[PDB]
Design a protein around this ligand. Sequence first.
Ligand SMILES: CCNS(=O)(=O)NC[C@H]1O[C@@H](n2cnc3c(N)ncnc32)[C@H](O)[C@@H]1O
Ligand SMILES: CCNS(=O)(=O)NC[C@H]1O[C@@H](n2cnc3c(N)ncnc32)[C@H](O)[C@@H]1O
Ligand SMILES: [Cl-]
Lengths: 634, 655, 483
Amino acid sequence: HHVHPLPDSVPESEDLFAPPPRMQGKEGRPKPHIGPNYESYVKEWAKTVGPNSDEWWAAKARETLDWYDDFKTVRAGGFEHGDVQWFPEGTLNAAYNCLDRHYYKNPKKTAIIYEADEPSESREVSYEELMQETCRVANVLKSYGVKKGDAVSIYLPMTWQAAAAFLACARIGAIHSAVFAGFSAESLRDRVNDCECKVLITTDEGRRGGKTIATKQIVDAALQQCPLVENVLVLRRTGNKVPMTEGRDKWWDEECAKMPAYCPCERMASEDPLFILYTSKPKGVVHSTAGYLLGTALTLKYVFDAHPDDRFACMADIGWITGHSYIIYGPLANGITTAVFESTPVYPTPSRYWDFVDKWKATQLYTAPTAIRLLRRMGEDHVHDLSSLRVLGSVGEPINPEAWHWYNDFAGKNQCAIVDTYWMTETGSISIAPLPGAISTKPGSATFPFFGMDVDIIDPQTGQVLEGNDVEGVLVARRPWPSIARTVYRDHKRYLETYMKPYPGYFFFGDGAARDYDGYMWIKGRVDDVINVSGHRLSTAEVESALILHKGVAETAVVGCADDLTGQAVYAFVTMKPEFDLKATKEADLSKELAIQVRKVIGPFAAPKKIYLPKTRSGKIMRRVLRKIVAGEG
Amino acid sequence: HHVHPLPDSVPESEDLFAPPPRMQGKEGRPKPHIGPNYESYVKEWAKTVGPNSDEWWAAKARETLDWYDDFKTVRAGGFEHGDVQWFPEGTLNAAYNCLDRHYYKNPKKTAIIYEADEPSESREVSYEELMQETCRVANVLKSYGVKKGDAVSIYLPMTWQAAAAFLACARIGAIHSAVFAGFSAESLRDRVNDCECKVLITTDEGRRGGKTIATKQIVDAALQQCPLVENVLVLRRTGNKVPMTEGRDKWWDEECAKMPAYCPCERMASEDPLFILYTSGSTGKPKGVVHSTAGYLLGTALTLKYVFDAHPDDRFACMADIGWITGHSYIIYGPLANGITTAVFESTPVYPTPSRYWDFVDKWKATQLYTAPTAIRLLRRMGEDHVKNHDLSSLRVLGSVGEPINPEAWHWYNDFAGKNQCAIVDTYWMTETGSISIAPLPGAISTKPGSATFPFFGMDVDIIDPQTGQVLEGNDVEGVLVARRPWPSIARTVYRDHKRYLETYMKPYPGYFFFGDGAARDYDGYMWIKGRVDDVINVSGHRLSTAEVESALILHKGVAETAVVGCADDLTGQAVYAFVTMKPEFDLKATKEADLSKELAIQVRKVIGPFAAPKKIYLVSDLPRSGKIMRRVLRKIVAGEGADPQIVEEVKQKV
Amino acid sequence: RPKPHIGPNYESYVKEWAKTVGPNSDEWWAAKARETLDWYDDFKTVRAGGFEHGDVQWFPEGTLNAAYNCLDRHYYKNPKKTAIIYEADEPSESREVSYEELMQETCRVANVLKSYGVKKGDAVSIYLPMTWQAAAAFLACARIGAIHSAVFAGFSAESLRDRVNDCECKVLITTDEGRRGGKTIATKQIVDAALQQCPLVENVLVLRRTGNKVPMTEGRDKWWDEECAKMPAYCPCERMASEDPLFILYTPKGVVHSTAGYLLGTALTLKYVFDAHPDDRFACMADIGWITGHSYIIYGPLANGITTAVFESTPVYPTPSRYWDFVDKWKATQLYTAPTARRMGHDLSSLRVLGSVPINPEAWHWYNDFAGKNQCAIVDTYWMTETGSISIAPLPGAISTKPGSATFPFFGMDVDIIDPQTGQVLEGNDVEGVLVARRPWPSIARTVYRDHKRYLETYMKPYPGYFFFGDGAARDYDGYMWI
Ligand SMILES: CCNS(=O)(=O)NC[C@H]1O[C@@H](n2cnc3c(N)ncnc32)[C@H](O)[C@@H]1O
Ligand SMILES: CCNS(=O)(=O)NC[C@H]1O[C@@H](n2cnc3c(N)ncnc32)[C@H](O)[C@@H]1O
Ligand SMILES: [Cl-]
């Protein structure tokens, strides 16, 4: 075969895992929504793409969400000019769909499982409580003069009120712009100025893993160069003394105590913007209302097989798109229970995830590879019952197949489906992932595209589509889907040039990908991280997966630097486990073993020329820093 | 029985009055909506409360009002957090329901009977004229930058244009805040700043009882300490010279002449706030009671239709002032929503003479009259010569609101205003309830002097023992009044002071709404509201209402009005002190002042008991704007402290 | 040739015109209102109000948007159809603009205006020549509920200063220069002169029609193409009430038109007076600065979903044949031109209906033979800014017409003539007097901006309960009108 899976130590013939009995109608668990096999997924999927799929999408939009005004047109527009429209004549409100309509049905049902940094301080927040808090904040924002279409910055740690602040903006038609609680003032400042907001929502302090985040202190520093901000609403998270500027700053609880506990919903057009989410000038990705909300609702229901009594535990941060979609909007739209985890996976112990799972009988767990490195690395003594789990998800970057099996074995007792979810901030919702009740998985593969996603592979050297299977190139989408980002805030040109110009006719994700002989999709990393050695273009995922097969390796990152005899050369930056003895295995001897590992697993063309990690707050490895340093640019 | 009715001079067996023939469909009058007996009231009422009342309320909401968008949910929320919701997904506009839809049906039907202070200046205002005036003001407010949800203060006397100012704000989604024309600048200023409005609507002057109110003069004084006000719209009521600040102030007639006579309606969510009505209440600051749109509007429409048995051609004569909740609900919103004729009375009941009410009724053939006990007592003091020589046959329902009505005043009302041929409706409610809470349905309920009787549709009230916090099951019980579940017209908050809203009405008896009134349900199930809990007097363990001691006093020949307050007493805890006003004709020389007092105390001792007999009686000329007697002032005077500051000194002298 | 909608004799035009007036006048206007336009919300009341107090209302409860009805709905049905034929001043610079392209430009501009804080109900002034982006400007203002005030591109800086200050607009849309009859119309120069005394105007959007160097006030002035490059190509439509104002057109008498009425009147007149059909190519040579360009270049044609022409030249540039080179080059199917234009000195078989807007009666024969070849129709049209849509015209495939007259007044308008000395209408035929109208029509102007007083003292108070046109008119034994 031309297309190889990510290097793994397990035979390929033993790496095809069918839906287990928990994802079958047995053991008293809900029968899957889609199942039991690959053909059942394809049968439904073919209704969601092609020239006769408007029928399916209209029904799903009318069944999934509540509308104030029906829509007439299902879809229009396209990539070339970026005029994407879905359900354009309809009106709705995101807070009505995430709060009110469930409050009216079961007001005492739990909406948020607030897992505080300290396990003792945790509690359940009901749809009644969350709605009242949202409506109070919404009334406060209106009293500040916030109007439909105004931007509101949010700088909140993972306390449950963060959901109320997001939904308060959506309730009144404001455009919330979340900034990870922990970015520098320079990062907070740039995002506040770009969106031109006049109101900022934040806390006095945060708490994560026992540490103290000086959110208010950072804000005051950033706001010295954010001229337009006139109002700041400070949640009293800790109560510890923080500076409160007179007039500009007010306490959340004092402001809310003056306001009523209900607020009307602003009737929003489908294409009114719901939020701006900046990405690390800053790129403010803009999502509209109806299509984004429907995408998050549909993906949560099918990719995680969500059922009414489920308790969904996404361990990400609301400052990132994974929090937007699968902590707040997705789960609350489906009306289930969602987790807001304010701690780290290592506090009080590396068993918090598992203590959390057993304490709350969580039905799905959704975290990232960068955190997955933690648990499997430190010890499986930390891994409990975990029987409540039924679907396990991973998001953020390629998952080395080695981490994949531990996830299947110890967290799932070989009884959970593992869903590797591929998507971007700009897709809004999950693009390629297995439906747990239908798809037999492979370690390290995203598998098949989700409803509405018609993806293909393009040879970047010819610009043409590679027909068939067992092909490799760059991933592109053929048609718009409802949750696609609609622009980059006040910079539509950057939007078109980045995603719509590189391969005209298609959307360009920016990732290398391959479709193997079985049709399974494999995402191998950024195209900008590809290294071309003597005509062999190498992905960062395959070299880094082969390295992690050597004893003692924890995490790696390979970058390319120019080479006069091979064009570029692979340079690998390697991190070792703490117990590993660097004296027994000399650094020169370690590199020799690693280069032989890569040569054996990939080929001589891939052997690193030199072996020696800078990571953003989102958990991503800053490979652009490793590349420039190797060249000698400070 | 343990529960006694308010003192009356008629035997209890002879003091139950069944709907007269005018409310039996006879004499050419329209058949009542509910009737003909108590059972017909209960049959409908039981559809309006309980866990299966959503069906009735959904239907009445869709039958009574015109909606731009239908609603899905009927009710949600509750007392505990103050998140009451009614018809939340629906949209409508109050001005469309009060003007446009009736204009489109019968544009020339009369909307307002404008009874000016001078009777010669009175005229009829049709729905077309009022709609056009409303739309001109709305355009004027919008030209000023007024947006949906902004507060607009109104300081207007009782001229018909006051309705156009209220409905102009409602038409564009502004929040109107009315201030009684006659409050001091100090009271106006507090209300203008609290609601944070930028636009004020007022007159150059007012006219009441022959006097001239210098509204603009008061306004200018108030606005020197109102930094947020940017625009003032001055109706040209008198034409006498007033100071007009350049730019800030503009003439109503000049501004409106520039605008079109139509304006689109703002589509409002049911729960968007419709108005703020401040009350000089509780203490310290003014309490801005906030009502939302759909539930308030539906509450006033339904109460007017059933409590006053309103039919399409009726001519409803509420003699209250639009600066108070009775004016909001039963001059403007209630009647105009029902599409009938409503009266705007610019005079007093004694100007030019005490026959004004009755001249008005016959002049316009009014079909229902709605006034207060303070005016019934006032007229009753001036003589039956001014009321005896009138027809008054057009009337068929007479209403009383504001406080408990003494059975003596009740009988004067029934005898001379209704000629024993009208139904008397005693309406109990508050600013905070939005609409009538407890009252008799005139075609169905047999009344008792001084009793409101039974709760209105949607009101499920109870009596609570304030010392046990428990509901007193059964009849012949006494305590404080409470409501069990929200109703559609309940106030939704206190403007920017939700804590004051929860603390005042929702915390004192958790699970309930606390009216603040003592109440009792007699053996027949009739409810009796006898006065504020803060006004109770306790003599040797006997908790006394001010209404029952004052009802017993007024049974003595010559008594016009009384006021009793409690004073501390070392041997009985408190003691009753009574302040008495007599009729003009009564001779103080024939019956010495001391001998009169003894007869009064013996009256109370006989009817209530010696513990209620006043220890001392002060004969005054008058008692100390809403028509309420300032008993808190008389209480402080008898203790030793220190609308008209002259009576206050007059009291201090006799005391 | 497609069959005309109304025909073939008068009894077909009496059975129809009898429905647009009278007691059941409502039932007909209600059907047409629902059939012609797309509504976001239905309407309950057909008509209310009258001339007396100036409270005219049509379809008050309904909501809608002019851009959705002139762009989106046709885009969704056939996006590549040509909405505009842009006949540049230089004939070889002409090109077709599709509904898609026209929609995307409108949405961009609409997004720009929103970034400047323009809100529903705000005023925006438009100082543009007859380039095709003028319709995108009009419709971008309508798309967001903003009130556009079109000021003809030839007006002086003084006349623009006055029109911009009356409407109180905070945003102005102009070009850097114009082009007409081979000449250059310095519009930004005139814009900078006037604005020195326009204290409310805070943002100006300048379209590069020539690229020539012009002054740009930093901060206030921004380039159209640079501002629009930052915005998405879709914008939501504001849900407007029928009686929300759509535009101000000063004659400083700023005539105001509501939305659903003016739009219904414009759509119906094109579909009948000119007998427009789906594939027709309506050519109107007016300017978007006047009510002729508003109603029969932009709103009427783009509402019916046909093709309309934006003619940027004169009738004699390059040569007096331009109309007829125009007509054959694009196969125009209707022609609409002024009185001004057989004195300075082609196939044309595609023309089917020909109209003007008084013309000497010999021009009626010349316009029927040299332009029609005794195979075309001829429709004469009189009206004014305050009427919203053409008032007096004959229906083409039904009514046998005569030179100089107009057979019958348009659907839903019933006029008469008053004796200016007795103030009594002269019933009957063979009469003369001052022209006035009876009852309300949908497209009637609703006020004069912030001078409803003048609105009454000019058209309502002069003759009680009537609309006073201000021009003398006469009727003859044939039931025909003369201005
Ligand atoms: C939506 C989360 N955004 S993200 O967490 O910022 N991820 C950063 C970037 O990593 C890539 N990516 C995401 N998920 C996967 C995956 N499962 N396998 C391989 N690659 C992946 C995408 O290009 C994304 O833009
Ligand atoms: C809507 C009235 N507004 S009011 O004029 O402000 N009345 C002041 C307060 O008096 C009490 N009250 C009112 N009506 C009655 C009545 N009929 N019998 C006994 N008590 C009554 C209420 O607590 C009210 O709030
Ligand atoms: Cl699996």
